[PDB]
Ligand binder design. Sequence first.
Ligand code: MNJ
Ligand code: ZN
Length: 272
Amino acid sequence: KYVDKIHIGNYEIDAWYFSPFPEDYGKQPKLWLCEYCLKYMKYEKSYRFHLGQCQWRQPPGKEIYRKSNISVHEVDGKDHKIYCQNLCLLAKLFLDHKTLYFDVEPFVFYILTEVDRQGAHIVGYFSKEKESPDGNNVSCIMILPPYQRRGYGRFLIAFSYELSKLESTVGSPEKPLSDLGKLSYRSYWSWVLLENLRDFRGTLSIKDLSQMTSITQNDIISTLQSLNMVKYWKGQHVICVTPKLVEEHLKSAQYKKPPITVDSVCLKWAPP
Ligand SMILES: O=C(NNS(=O)(=O)c1ccccc1)c1cc(-c2ccccc2)ccc1F
Ligand SMILES: [Zn+2]
């Protein structure tokens, strides 16, 4: 009665939440999505016919990043409305708190793919408001279940701050975050801050760290608090750590998986 299972690419994936596909589409056992254009279909046979006809082999919009077989496309919601709406309905299957599916023109979407000989296969995305009055540098972020916890979420979060840096601005994801979202951001912030604390020594203030990472002072402070690296003095949070403690944190299992990194040389983008 609601959509509870999709087929996309070679994956069958169970829904986590209600998404408002038209009612007729929920009635079916599965919903079938073209992995390239994201068209959603009611039957295995309309899906297979679509597969033979559809000419898309990657997302629309501009490939603003490409390194080996990892690519990001920037897709403006005003120029590719139907694709973006299809993407938001797909995302809402895995996001409890997303509430915007149809009004996509105020958003830009950054679609992460992993490419082979067949084409560019969707892994996840984040959306971002063109004009965020609240300084949010991500609106929603979603990694499809079979790619979660495999470094792709980490890549997109780094990606979003690489945009913020090029805009000379600080940014923070729109709240509330999903459970995995919060763990992923906290662990991303800690990694980046620790590595900067190692690489200087160094009279880095919290403001310094904010300017260098585009992470907000508040997100820096709450992260340094959970690491016990901040003291408080007459109303001001102040960095308090030894080189040894920094390396103890960095040697931990948390930071041991080799990351897929964002190579700023491969990013093609200037603020609009
Ligand atoms: O897959 C994710 N994190 N695991 S990760 O291996 O990329 C990682 C992220 C940050 C630091 C280390 C590893 C992830 C997943 C989501 C997500 C959130 C809600 C629904 C579906 C996916 C959002 C951000 C994420 F980073
Ligand atoms: Zn298609």
